[PDB]
Scaffold this active site. Structure first.
Site, PDB file in Angstrom:
ATOM      1  CE1 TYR A 282       1.965  -0.506  -0.704  1.00  0.00           C
ATOM      2  CE2 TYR A 282      -0.123  -1.636  -1.079  1.00  0.00           C
ATOM      3  CZ  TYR A 282       1.116  -1.211  -1.530  1.00  0.00           C
ATOM      4  OH  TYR A 282       1.565  -1.524  -2.783  1.00  0.00           O
TER       5      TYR A 282
ATOM      6  CG  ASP B 292      -0.540  -7.108  -4.568  1.00  0.00           C
ATOM      7  OD1 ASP B 292      -1.479  -6.424  -5.015  1.00  0.00           O
ATOM      8  OD2 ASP B 292       0.442  -6.602  -3.996  1.00  0.00           O
TER       9      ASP B 292
ATOM     10  CG  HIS C 151       0.385  -3.037 -10.448  1.00  0.00           C
ATOM     11  ND1 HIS C 151      -0.773  -3.710 -10.783  1.00  0.00           N
ATOM     12  CD2 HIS C 151       0.367  -2.901  -9.098  1.00  0.00           C
ATOM     13  CE1 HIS C 151      -1.463  -3.960  -9.680  1.00  0.00           C
ATOM     14  NE2 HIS C 151      -0.807  -3.455  -8.649  1.00  0.00           N
TER      15      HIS C 151
ATOM     16  CG  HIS D 296      -4.016  -3.909  -6.143  1.00  0.00           C
ATOM     17  ND1 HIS D 296      -3.248  -3.737  -5.006  1.00  0.00           N
ATOM     18  CD2 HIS D 296      -5.064  -3.070  -6.011  1.00  0.00           C
ATOM     19  CE1 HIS D 296      -3.793  -2.810  -4.244  1.00  0.00           C
ATOM     20  NE2 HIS D 296      -4.903  -2.395  -4.828  1.00  0.00           N
TER      21      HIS D 296
ATOM     22  CG  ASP E 161      -1.930  -5.362  -1.603  1.00  0.00           C
ATOM     23  OD1 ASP E 161      -1.932  -6.595  -1.836  1.00  0.00           O
ATOM     24  OD2 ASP E 161      -1.603  -4.488  -2.444  1.00  0.00           O
TER      25      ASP E 161
HETATM   26  N1  LIG Z   1      -3.429   4.785  -6.876  1.00  0.00           N
HETATM   27  C1  LIG Z   1      -3.971   3.483  -7.208  1.00  0.00           C
HETATM   28  C2  LIG Z   1      -3.179   2.306  -6.627  1.00  0.00           C
HETATM   29  C3  LIG Z   1      -2.022   1.859  -7.260  1.00  0.00           C
HETATM   30  C4  LIG Z   1      -1.329   0.771  -6.734  1.00  0.00           C
HETATM   31  C5  LIG Z   1      -1.795   0.135  -5.587  1.00  0.00           C
HETATM   32  C6  LIG Z   1      -1.072  -1.075  -4.997  1.00  0.00           C
HETATM   33  O1  LIG Z   1      -1.273  -1.431  -3.871  1.00  0.00           O
HETATM   34  C7  LIG Z   1      -0.127  -1.843  -5.917  1.00  0.00           C
HETATM   35  S1  LIG Z   1       0.551  -3.410  -5.250  1.00  0.00           S
HETATM   36  C8  LIG Z   1      -2.958   0.570  -4.986  1.00  0.00           C
HETATM   37  C9  LIG Z   1      -3.647   1.651  -5.500  1.00  0.00           C
HETATM   38  K   LIG Z   2      -3.143 -10.644  -7.488  1.00  0.00           K
HETATM   39 ZN   LIG Z   3      -1.339  -4.476  -4.392  1.00  0.00          ZN
END
Ligand SMILES: NCc1ccc(C(=O)CS)cc1
Ligand SMILES: [K+]
Ligand SMILES: [Zn+2]
Ligand SMILES: [K+]
Length: 357
Positions: A304, A171, A133, A173, A264
């Site tokens: 996580y 991932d 990110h 996200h 995740d």
């Molecule tokens: N607060 C929102 C949020 C930010 C990052 C994550 C990740 O898991 C990044 S890999 C998930 C939620």
């Molecule tokens: K991804």
């Molecule tokens: Zn993530």
């Protein structure tokens, strides 16, 4: 063939001083390392040392301002640390954060160097904080510097500038930072699979949709596979790999594969809401090993549930070591929205990749 492994307990020092139970825990990495020991995988790997990335290396992808701000946090008092972290989307900072982010990047550079010089065939990097990110100019989503993006540019710096690097980001996200860093670049193919929900899921941007194919010289070289309206798992991921990831990847013919390997999307994750299994991640790894003469570096991103991530990443390392894939559960028919997602990406990318036609 030799598999490298990098892990350094110093990366546990990055911590959340106000919320010690924040999900991006120091023990994410020690638990994965422990599971490798428990399964007798660690002694089958060649240990690669961690090192600090240099500021010059950080500048391969990041602005001088962003580097300077995170660097300055090493000397901040808690009040400054708290205020600075609150300036970003989803960031906590301690005095050790900068060092830990440098070690995560440097560990991956050493691993990529070992792969590219033939000291190891492939490697796994058990690192934190995560990277995908992080943007050129800002921290975001638990990430300070974009470790995978930096490793791609570092790889190019020690081989040739146009070395073809594939980054597969599984991932749950979208890696907004990785997409943006390489959006105009045809030497780094970015393929992300991610929970999207029509832009409602973190990082909450339509930049993650299937119609963002890259820009300029990079048109065709950004592949987003966005999931909507379904608890996706092994059937959907296997189908995305069969129809999209592997055909595109084979056509691109990477010379190095980096996996932004967040866990995740795993069954049991407290944030992702998906159900990819450890045997699913093993199969995805096994497929990627057929690319780039097996030159694959698996880089920890998110994930996580400590048990889920330890089992899942360990299974990936088992694949890199040459163990045969475990058996998947009987694959149910795809959730109907997953077929829609795949077909949307196929239509977006068949103009650029004849293997999809
Ligand atoms: N607060 C929102 C949020 C930010 C990052 C994550 C990740 O898991 C990044 S890999 C998930 C939620
Ligand atoms: K991804
Ligand atoms: Zn993530
Ligand atoms: K790209």
């Amino acid at each position: 063939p030799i598999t490298g492994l990098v892990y350094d307990q110093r990366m546990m020092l990055h911590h959340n001083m106000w919320d010690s139970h924040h999900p991006e825990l120091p023990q994410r990495i020690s638990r994965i390392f422990s599971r490798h020991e428990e399964l007798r995988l660690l002694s089958r790997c060649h240990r690669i040392p961690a090192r600090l990335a240099t500021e010059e290396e950080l500048a391969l992808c990041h602005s001088s301002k962003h580097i300077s701000i995170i660097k300055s946090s090493e000397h901040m008092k808690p009040r400054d640390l708290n205020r600075l972290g609150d300036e970003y989307n989803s960031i906590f900072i301690s005095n050790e954060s900068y060092t830990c982010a440098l070690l995560a990047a440097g560990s991956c550079f050493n691993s990529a160097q070992a792969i590219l010089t033939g000291q190891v065939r492939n490697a796994v990097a058990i690192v934190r904080p995560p990277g995908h990110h992080a943007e050129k100019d800002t921290a975001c989503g638990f990430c300070f510097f974009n470790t995978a993006a930096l490793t791609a540019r570092y790889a190019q710096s020690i081989t040739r500038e146009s070395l073809r690097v594939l980054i597969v980001d599984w991932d749950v996200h979208h890696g907004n930072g990785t997409q943006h860093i390489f959006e105009e670049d045809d030497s780094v193919l970015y393929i992300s699979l991610h929970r999207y929900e029509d832009g409602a899921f973190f990082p909450n941007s339509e930049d993650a949709n299937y119609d963002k194919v890259g820009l300029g010289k990079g048109r065709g070289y950004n592949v987003n596979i966005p999931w909507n309206g379904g608890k996706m798992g092994d059937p959907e991921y296997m189908a995305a790999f069969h129809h999209l990831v592997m055909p595109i990847a084979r056509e691109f013919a990477p010379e190095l594969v980096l996996v932004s390997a967040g866990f995740d999307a795993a069954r049991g994750d407290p944030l992702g809401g998906f159900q990819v299994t450890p045997e699913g991640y093993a199969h995805l790894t096994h497929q990627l090993m057929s690319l780039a003469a097996g030159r694959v570096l698996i880089i920890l991103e998110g994930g996580y549930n400590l048990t889920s991530i330890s089992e899942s990443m360990s299974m990936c390392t088992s694949m890199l070591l040459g163990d045969s894939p475990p058996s998947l559960d009987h694959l149910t028919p795809l959730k109907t929205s997953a077929t829609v997602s795949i077909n949307n990406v196929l239509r977006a990318h068949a103009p650029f990749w004849s293997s999809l036609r």
